[PDB]
Amino acid sequence: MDLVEEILRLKEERNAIILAHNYQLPEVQDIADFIGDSLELARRATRVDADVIVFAGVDFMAETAKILNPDKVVLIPSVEHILEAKRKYPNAPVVLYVNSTAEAKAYADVTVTSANAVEVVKKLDSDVVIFGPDKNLAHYVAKMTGKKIIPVFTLDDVERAKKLHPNAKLMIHPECIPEVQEKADIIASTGGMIKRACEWDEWVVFTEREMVYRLRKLYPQKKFYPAREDAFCAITLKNIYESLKDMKYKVEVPEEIARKARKAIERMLEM
């Protein structure tokens, strides 16, 4: 059958929109109504203009879209440590990376993505911030904001990369360990990488390999080398079709939890 044509018919029949993350397969990105990083996706999902959202991304972000649209259908194609940290730091605000459970977000004062972690944390009064669960992003934030660190790819790849592409600059994700972050020409979320790619003609990409295809698509003239070229490698176009055909893998979040996480996420967007 023709998957593209079937998905197009079902999108209309179900009154659905397809949102894709930057790491999705080219075939999935090609069928999406919008592609972006977590922040860009949260914004697009706000007050969504459809009855159904097919979210081609990780489970925790599909939950974010659901939390933001409690009365809409969200389909995905495929805790104690916080309270303890809070008891030791009663006045410190809790900042949770979107890469976390909805339940965890319920304990957060505000959430962050890789693109806005620095901005949001700098706007928090407290000089001490509880931040989790990604330790590497926590280090990046600590270094960029100068606040207290209340947490809750290797150098060989960098060298091999420089050896093969001497004139290429490096795009490194804040999720990479500190050592690598230090060697970066630019540190950014996938959304940031796309925005700043115009700053050079050749780039070595330190993030998921699928991002290379996204960048080549947006900048056909530039050269994008994956961090580990020789390394061999997911939601498929067929999964997208089946998702719409069977309305499956509905994403749900208990009201109590959802209400609290929603306050943290909507605050993130305002900040």
PDB file of all heavy atoms in Angstrom, residues 101-134:
ATOM      1  N   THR A 101       9.907  11.768  34.035  1.00  0.00           N
ATOM      2  CA  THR A 101       8.511  11.332  34.110  1.00  0.00           C
ATOM      3  C   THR A 101       7.553  12.466  34.466  1.00  0.00           C
ATOM      4  O   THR A 101       7.958  13.489  35.023  1.00  0.00           O
ATOM      5  CB  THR A 101       8.325  10.222  35.162  1.00  0.00           C
ATOM      6  OG1 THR A 101       8.579  10.755  36.467  1.00  0.00           O
ATOM      7  CG2 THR A 101       9.284   9.067  34.895  1.00  0.00           C
ATOM      8  N   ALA A 102       6.277  12.277  34.141  1.00  0.00           N
ATOM      9  CA  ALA A 102       5.262  13.269  34.457  1.00  0.00           C
ATOM     10  C   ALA A 102       5.175  13.367  35.981  1.00  0.00           C
ATOM     11  O   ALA A 102       4.981  14.445  36.536  1.00  0.00           O
ATOM     12  CB  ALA A 102       3.915  12.850  33.877  1.00  0.00           C
ATOM     13  N   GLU A 103       5.329  12.232  36.652  1.00  0.00           N
ATOM     14  CA  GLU A 103       5.271  12.212  38.110  1.00  0.00           C
ATOM     15  C   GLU A 103       6.371  13.080  38.708  1.00  0.00           C
ATOM     16  O   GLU A 103       6.140  13.805  39.673  1.00  0.00           O
ATOM     17  CB  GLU A 103       5.404  10.783  38.638  1.00  0.00           C
ATOM     18  CG  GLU A 103       5.414  10.699  40.160  1.00  0.00           C
ATOM     19  CD  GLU A 103       5.430   9.271  40.663  1.00  0.00           C
ATOM     20  OE1 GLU A 103       6.368   8.524  40.312  1.00  0.00           O
ATOM     21  OE2 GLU A 103       4.500   8.896  41.409  1.00  0.00           O
ATOM     22  N   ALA A 104       7.564  13.010  38.129  1.00  0.00           N
ATOM     23  CA  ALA A 104       8.684  13.802  38.621  1.00  0.00           C
ATOM     24  C   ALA A 104       8.424  15.290  38.392  1.00  0.00           C
ATOM     25  O   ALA A 104       8.750  16.127  39.239  1.00  0.00           O
ATOM     26  CB  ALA A 104       9.975  13.377  37.930  1.00  0.00           C
ATOM     27  N   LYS A 105       7.835  15.614  37.246  1.00  0.00           N
ATOM     28  CA  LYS A 105       7.529  17.003  36.921  1.00  0.00           C
ATOM     29  C   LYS A 105       6.540  17.590  37.927  1.00  0.00           C
ATOM     30  O   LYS A 105       6.512  18.797  38.147  1.00  0.00           O
ATOM     31  CB  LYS A 105       6.952  17.109  35.504  1.00  0.00           C
ATOM     32  CG  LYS A 105       7.957  16.841  34.394  1.00  0.00           C
ATOM     33  CD  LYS A 105       7.324  17.077  33.030  1.00  0.00           C
ATOM     34  CE  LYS A 105       8.332  16.911  31.903  1.00  0.00           C
ATOM     35  NZ  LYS A 105       8.900  15.538  31.857  1.00  0.00           N
ATOM     36  N   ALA A 106       5.730  16.730  38.538  1.00  0.00           N
ATOM     37  CA  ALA A 106       4.754  17.186  39.527  1.00  0.00           C
ATOM     38  C   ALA A 106       5.444  17.766  40.766  1.00  0.00           C
ATOM     39  O   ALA A 106       4.843  18.527  41.524  1.00  0.00           O
ATOM     40  CB  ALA A 106       3.839  16.031  39.929  1.00  0.00           C
ATOM     41  N   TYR A 107       6.706  17.400  40.965  1.00  0.00           N
ATOM     42  CA  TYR A 107       7.481  17.880  42.107  1.00  0.00           C
ATOM     43  C   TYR A 107       8.361  19.070  41.727  1.00  0.00           C
ATOM     44  O   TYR A 107       9.082  19.611  42.565  1.00  0.00           O
ATOM     45  CB  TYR A 107       8.377  16.755  42.643  1.00  0.00           C
ATOM     46  CG  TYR A 107       7.625  15.608  43.280  1.00  0.00           C
ATOM     47  CD1 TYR A 107       7.384  14.432  42.571  1.00  0.00           C
ATOM     48  CD2 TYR A 107       7.140  15.703  44.584  1.00  0.00           C
ATOM     49  CE1 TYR A 107       6.677  13.380  43.142  1.00  0.00           C
ATOM     50  CE2 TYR A 107       6.430  14.652  45.170  1.00  0.00           C
ATOM     51  CZ  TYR A 107       6.202  13.494  44.441  1.00  0.00           C
ATOM     52  OH  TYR A 107       5.506  12.447  45.007  1.00  0.00           O
ATOM     53  N   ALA A 108       8.307  19.475  40.465  1.00  0.00           N
ATOM     54  CA  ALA A 108       9.133  20.585  40.003  1.00  0.00           C
ATOM     55  C   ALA A 108       8.444  21.932  40.095  1.00  0.00           C
ATOM     56  O   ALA A 108       7.222  22.020  40.035  1.00  0.00           O
ATOM     57  CB  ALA A 108       9.575  20.337  38.553  1.00  0.00           C
ATOM     58  N   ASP A 109       9.240  22.984  40.257  1.00  0.00           N
ATOM     59  CA  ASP A 109       8.712  24.341  40.294  1.00  0.00           C
ATOM     60  C   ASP A 109       8.628  24.793  38.834  1.00  0.00           C
ATOM     61  O   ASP A 109       7.732  25.545  38.447  1.00  0.00           O
ATOM     62  CB  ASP A 109       9.651  25.262  41.079  1.00  0.00           C
ATOM     63  CG  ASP A 109       9.635  24.973  42.569  1.00  0.00           C
ATOM     64  OD1 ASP A 109       8.605  25.258  43.220  1.00  0.00           O
ATOM     65  OD2 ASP A 109      10.646  24.447  43.085  1.00  0.00           O
ATOM     66  N   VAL A 110       9.566  24.308  38.025  1.00  0.00           N
ATOM     67  CA  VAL A 110       9.610  24.651  36.603  1.00  0.00           C
ATOM     68  C   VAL A 110      10.453  23.624  35.842  1.00  0.00           C
ATOM     69  O   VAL A 110      11.384  23.035  36.398  1.00  0.00           O
ATOM     70  CB  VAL A 110      10.211  26.073  36.390  1.00  0.00           C
ATOM     71  CG1 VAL A 110      11.677  26.093  36.792  1.00  0.00           C
ATOM     72  CG2 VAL A 110      10.045  26.509  34.948  1.00  0.00           C
ATOM     73  N   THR A 111      10.121  23.400  34.575  1.00  0.00           N
ATOM     74  CA  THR A 111      10.875  22.453  33.751  1.00  0.00           C
ATOM     75  C   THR A 111      11.786  23.199  32.785  1.00  0.00           C
ATOM     76  O   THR A 111      11.633  24.402  32.587  1.00  0.00           O
ATOM     77  CB  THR A 111       9.938  21.541  32.906  1.00  0.00           C
ATOM     78  OG1 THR A 111       9.005  22.349  32.173  1.00  0.00           O
ATOM     79  CG2 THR A 111       9.176  20.564  33.794  1.00  0.00           C
ATOM     80  N   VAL A 112      12.741  22.481  32.196  1.00  0.00           N
ATOM     81  CA  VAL A 112      13.644  23.068  31.209  1.00  0.00           C
ATOM     82  C   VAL A 112      13.981  22.053  30.122  1.00  0.00           C
ATOM     83  O   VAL A 112      13.846  20.842  30.320  1.00  0.00           O
ATOM     84  CB  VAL A 112      14.996  23.547  31.823  1.00  0.00           C
ATOM     85  CG1 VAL A 112      14.752  24.633  32.859  1.00  0.00           C
ATOM     86  CG2 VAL A 112      15.756  22.366  32.431  1.00  0.00           C
ATOM     87  N   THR A 113      14.403  22.567  28.971  1.00  0.00           N
ATOM     88  CA  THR A 113      14.837  21.743  27.853  1.00  0.00           C
ATOM     89  C   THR A 113      16.294  22.156  27.675  1.00  0.00           C
ATOM     90  O   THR A 113      16.768  23.053  28.377  1.00  0.00           O
ATOM     91  CB  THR A 113      14.066  22.062  26.543  1.00  0.00           C
ATOM     92  OG1 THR A 113      14.488  23.334  26.032  1.00  0.00           O
ATOM     93  CG2 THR A 113      12.564  22.097  26.795  1.00  0.00           C
ATOM     94  N   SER A 114      17.002  21.519  26.746  1.00  0.00           N
ATOM     95  CA  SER A 114      18.404  21.851  26.508  1.00  0.00           C
ATOM     96  C   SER A 114      18.597  23.269  25.989  1.00  0.00           C
ATOM     97  O   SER A 114      19.619  23.898  26.257  1.00  0.00           O
ATOM     98  CB  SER A 114      19.028  20.874  25.511  1.00  0.00           C
ATOM     99  OG  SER A 114      19.085  19.570  26.055  1.00  0.00           O
ATOM    100  N   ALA A 115      17.613  23.771  25.251  1.00  0.00           N
ATOM    101  CA  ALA A 115      17.690  25.111  24.676  1.00  0.00           C
ATOM    102  C   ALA A 115      17.492  26.260  25.671  1.00  0.00           C
ATOM    103  O   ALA A 115      18.081  27.333  25.503  1.00  0.00           O
ATOM    104  CB  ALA A 115      16.677  25.241  23.548  1.00  0.00           C
ATOM    105  N   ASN A 116      16.673  26.045  26.698  1.00  0.00           N
ATOM    106  CA  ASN A 116      16.403  27.113  27.664  1.00  0.00           C
ATOM    107  C   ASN A 116      16.873  26.885  29.102  1.00  0.00           C
ATOM    108  O   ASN A 116      16.603  27.714  29.976  1.00  0.00           O
ATOM    109  CB  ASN A 116      14.902  27.428  27.683  1.00  0.00           C
ATOM    110  CG  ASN A 116      14.059  26.264  28.196  1.00  0.00           C
ATOM    111  OD1 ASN A 116      14.579  25.305  28.765  1.00  0.00           O
ATOM    112  ND2 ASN A 116      12.747  26.356  28.007  1.00  0.00           N
ATOM    113  N   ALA A 117      17.574  25.783  29.359  1.00  0.00           N
ATOM    114  CA  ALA A 117      18.040  25.504  30.714  1.00  0.00           C
ATOM    115  C   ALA A 117      18.799  26.686  31.328  1.00  0.00           C
ATOM    116  O   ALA A 117      18.546  27.061  32.474  1.00  0.00           O
ATOM    117  CB  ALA A 117      18.917  24.259  30.726  1.00  0.00           C
ATOM    118  N   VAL A 118      19.725  27.269  30.572  1.00  0.00           N
ATOM    119  CA  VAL A 118      20.505  28.395  31.079  1.00  0.00           C
ATOM    120  C   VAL A 118      19.636  29.627  31.362  1.00  0.00           C
ATOM    121  O   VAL A 118      19.691  30.187  32.459  1.00  0.00           O
ATOM    122  CB  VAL A 118      21.635  28.786  30.094  1.00  0.00           C
ATOM    123  CG1 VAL A 118      22.373  30.013  30.609  1.00  0.00           C
ATOM    124  CG2 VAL A 118      22.608  27.630  29.935  1.00  0.00           C
ATOM    125  N   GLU A 119      18.843  30.036  30.373  1.00  0.00           N
ATOM    126  CA  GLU A 119      17.958  31.201  30.484  1.00  0.00           C
ATOM    127  C   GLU A 119      17.046  31.137  31.702  1.00  0.00           C
ATOM    128  O   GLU A 119      16.942  32.098  32.466  1.00  0.00           O
ATOM    129  CB  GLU A 119      17.052  31.319  29.250  1.00  0.00           C
ATOM    130  CG  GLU A 119      17.740  31.130  27.921  1.00  0.00           C
ATOM    131  CD  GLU A 119      16.758  31.037  26.762  1.00  0.00           C
ATOM    132  OE1 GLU A 119      15.573  31.403  26.946  1.00  0.00           O
ATOM    133  OE2 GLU A 119      17.178  30.602  25.668  1.00  0.00           O
ATOM    134  N   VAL A 120      16.364  30.006  31.848  1.00  0.00           N
ATOM    135  CA  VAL A 120      15.428  29.794  32.943  1.00  0.00           C
ATOM    136  C   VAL A 120      16.103  29.797  34.311  1.00  0.00           C
ATOM    137  O   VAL A 120      15.611  30.417  35.252  1.00  0.00           O
ATOM    138  CB  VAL A 120      14.655  28.464  32.743  1.00  0.00           C
ATOM    139  CG1 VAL A 120      13.776  28.170  33.945  1.00  0.00           C
ATOM    140  CG2 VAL A 120      13.796  28.555  31.486  1.00  0.00           C
ATOM    141  N   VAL A 121      17.231  29.106  34.421  1.00  0.00           N
ATOM    142  CA  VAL A 121      17.947  29.046  35.688  1.00  0.00           C
ATOM    143  C   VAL A 121      18.505  30.415  36.090  1.00  0.00           C
ATOM    144  O   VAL A 121      18.539  30.757  37.278  1.00  0.00           O
ATOM    145  CB  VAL A 121      19.090  28.005  35.623  1.00  0.00           C
ATOM    146  CG1 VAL A 121      19.985  28.125  36.849  1.00  0.00           C
ATOM    147  CG2 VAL A 121      18.491  26.598  35.549  1.00  0.00           C
ATOM    148  N   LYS A 122      18.934  31.201  35.108  1.00  0.00           N
ATOM    149  CA  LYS A 122      19.470  32.527  35.398  1.00  0.00           C
ATOM    150  C   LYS A 122      18.382  33.457  35.930  1.00  0.00           C
ATOM    151  O   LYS A 122      18.670  34.416  36.640  1.00  0.00           O
ATOM    152  CB  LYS A 122      20.117  33.132  34.146  1.00  0.00           C
ATOM    153  CG  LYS A 122      21.398  32.419  33.728  1.00  0.00           C
ATOM    154  CD  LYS A 122      21.991  32.978  32.443  1.00  0.00           C
ATOM    155  CE  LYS A 122      22.522  34.386  32.624  1.00  0.00           C
ATOM    156  NZ  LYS A 122      23.190  34.870  31.382  1.00  0.00           N
ATOM    157  N   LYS A 123      17.130  33.161  35.590  1.00  0.00           N
ATOM    158  CA  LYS A 123      16.005  33.971  36.040  1.00  0.00           C
ATOM    159  C   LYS A 123      15.487  33.558  37.417  1.00  0.00           C
ATOM    160  O   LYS A 123      14.583  34.192  37.959  1.00  0.00           O
ATOM    161  CB  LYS A 123      14.860  33.901  35.032  1.00  0.00           C
ATOM    162  CG  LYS A 123      15.129  34.617  33.726  1.00  0.00           C
ATOM    163  CD  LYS A 123      13.919  34.526  32.816  1.00  0.00           C
ATOM    164  CE  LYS A 123      14.139  35.281  31.523  1.00  0.00           C
ATOM    165  NZ  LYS A 123      12.894  35.315  30.705  1.00  0.00           N
ATOM    166  N   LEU A 124      16.049  32.492  37.978  1.00  0.00           N
ATOM    167  CA  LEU A 124      15.630  32.044  39.298  1.00  0.00           C
ATOM    168  C   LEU A 124      16.430  32.802  40.354  1.00  0.00           C
ATOM    169  O   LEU A 124      17.654  32.874  40.278  1.00  0.00           O
ATOM    170  CB  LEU A 124      15.849  30.535  39.444  1.00  0.00           C
ATOM    171  CG  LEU A 124      15.017  29.648  38.510  1.00  0.00           C
ATOM    172  CD1 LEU A 124      15.319  28.184  38.779  1.00  0.00           C
ATOM    173  CD2 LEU A 124      13.541  29.932  38.723  1.00  0.00           C
ATOM    174  N   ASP A 125      15.735  33.376  41.332  1.00  0.00           N
ATOM    175  CA  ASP A 125      16.393  34.136  42.394  1.00  0.00           C
ATOM    176  C   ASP A 125      17.473  33.354  43.124  1.00  0.00           C
ATOM    177  O   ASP A 125      18.636  33.756  43.155  1.00  0.00           O
ATOM    178  CB  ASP A 125      15.370  34.620  43.424  1.00  0.00           C
ATOM    179  CG  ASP A 125      14.655  35.875  42.989  1.00  0.00           C
ATOM    180  OD1 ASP A 125      15.341  36.884  42.723  1.00  0.00           O
ATOM    181  OD2 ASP A 125      13.408  35.855  42.919  1.00  0.00           O
ATOM    182  N   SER A 126      17.069  32.239  43.719  1.00  0.00           N
ATOM    183  CA  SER A 126      17.969  31.388  44.486  1.00  0.00           C
ATOM    184  C   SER A 126      19.319  31.155  43.821  1.00  0.00           C
ATOM    185  O   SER A 126      19.405  30.974  42.606  1.00  0.00           O
ATOM    186  CB  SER A 126      17.292  30.043  44.764  1.00  0.00           C
ATOM    187  OG  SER A 126      18.090  29.238  45.610  1.00  0.00           O
ATOM    188  N   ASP A 127      20.372  31.166  44.630  1.00  0.00           N
ATOM    189  CA  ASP A 127      21.722  30.939  44.135  1.00  0.00           C
ATOM    190  C   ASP A 127      21.973  29.437  44.142  1.00  0.00           C
ATOM    191  O   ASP A 127      22.968  28.952  43.605  1.00  0.00           O
ATOM    192  CB  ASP A 127      22.743  31.642  45.028  1.00  0.00           C
ATOM    193  CG  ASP A 127      24.170  31.418  44.565  1.00  0.00           C
ATOM    194  OD1 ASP A 127      24.501  31.842  43.436  1.00  0.00           O
ATOM    195  OD2 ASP A 127      24.959  30.816  45.328  1.00  0.00           O
ATOM    196  N   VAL A 128      21.054  28.708  44.764  1.00  0.00           N
ATOM    197  CA  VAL A 128      21.137  27.258  44.848  1.00  0.00           C
ATOM    198  C   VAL A 128      19.915  26.680  44.137  1.00  0.00           C
ATOM    199  O   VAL A 128      18.780  27.072  44.412  1.00  0.00           O
ATOM    200  CB  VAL A 128      21.154  26.790  46.318  1.00  0.00           C
ATOM    201  CG1 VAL A 128      21.353  25.284  46.387  1.00  0.00           C
ATOM    202  CG2 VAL A 128      22.260  27.512  47.077  1.00  0.00           C
ATOM    203  N   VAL A 129      20.146  25.752  43.216  1.00  0.00           N
ATOM    204  CA  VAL A 129      19.050  25.154  42.466  1.00  0.00           C
ATOM    205  C   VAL A 129      19.128  23.633  42.415  1.00  0.00           C
ATOM    206  O   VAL A 129      20.187  23.070  42.151  1.00  0.00           O
ATOM    207  CB  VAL A 129      19.034  25.685  41.003  1.00  0.00           C
ATOM    208  CG1 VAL A 129      17.857  25.100  40.246  1.00  0.00           C
ATOM    209  CG2 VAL A 129      18.966  27.206  40.995  1.00  0.00           C
ATOM    210  N   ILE A 130      18.013  22.968  42.695  1.00  0.00           N
ATOM    211  CA  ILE A 130      17.961  21.518  42.606  1.00  0.00           C
ATOM    212  C   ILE A 130      17.698  21.295  41.109  1.00  0.00           C
ATOM    213  O   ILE A 130      16.746  21.841  40.550  1.00  0.00           O
ATOM    214  CB  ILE A 130      16.815  20.938  43.469  1.00  0.00           C
ATOM    215  CG1 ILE A 130      17.081  21.249  44.952  1.00  0.00           C
ATOM    216  CG2 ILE A 130      16.710  19.429  43.262  1.00  0.00           C
ATOM    217  CD1 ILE A 130      16.006  20.756  45.914  1.00  0.00           C
ATOM    218  N   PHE A 131      18.552  20.512  40.459  1.00  0.00           N
ATOM    219  CA  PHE A 131      18.422  20.286  39.021  1.00  0.00           C
ATOM    220  C   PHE A 131      18.673  18.826  38.665  1.00  0.00           C
ATOM    221  O   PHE A 131      19.642  18.228  39.130  1.00  0.00           O
ATOM    222  CB  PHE A 131      19.431  21.183  38.288  1.00  0.00           C
ATOM    223  CG  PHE A 131      19.282  21.193  36.787  1.00  0.00           C
ATOM    224  CD1 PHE A 131      18.081  20.841  36.178  1.00  0.00           C
ATOM    225  CD2 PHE A 131      20.344  21.596  35.982  1.00  0.00           C
ATOM    226  CE1 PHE A 131      17.940  20.891  34.789  1.00  0.00           C
ATOM    227  CE2 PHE A 131      20.213  21.649  34.594  1.00  0.00           C
ATOM    228  CZ  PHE A 131      19.011  21.297  33.997  1.00  0.00           C
ATOM    229  N   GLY A 132      17.794  18.260  37.841  1.00  0.00           N
ATOM    230  CA  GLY A 132      17.941  16.873  37.432  1.00  0.00           C
ATOM    231  C   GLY A 132      17.035  16.528  36.262  1.00  0.00           C
ATOM    232  O   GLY A 132      16.230  17.362  35.850  1.00  0.00           O
ATOM    233  N   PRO A 133      17.120  15.300  35.725  1.00  0.00           N
ATOM    234  CA  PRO A 133      18.034  14.252  36.192  1.00  0.00           C
ATOM    235  C   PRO A 133      19.320  14.066  35.384  1.00  0.00           C
ATOM    236  O   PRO A 133      20.105  13.163  35.671  1.00  0.00           O
ATOM    237  CB  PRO A 133      17.161  13.009  36.151  1.00  0.00           C
ATOM    238  CG  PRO A 133      16.387  13.228  34.891  1.00  0.00           C
ATOM    239  CD  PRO A 133      16.016  14.710  34.941  1.00  0.00           C
ATOM    240  N   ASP A 134      19.542  14.901  34.377  1.00  0.00           N
ATOM    241  CA  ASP A 134      20.746  14.765  33.564  1.00  0.00           C
ATOM    242  C   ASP A 134      21.918  15.500  34.195  1.00  0.00           C
ATOM    243  O   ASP A 134      21.938  16.731  34.263  1.00  0.00           O
ATOM    244  CB  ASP A 134      20.507  15.292  32.148  1.00  0.00           C
ATOM    245  CG  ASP A 134      21.640  14.937  31.200  1.00  0.00           C
ATOM    246  OD1 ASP A 134      22.755  15.469  31.374  1.00  0.00           O
ATOM    247  OD2 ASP A 134      21.417  14.116  30.286  1.00  0.00           O
TER     248      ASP A 134
END
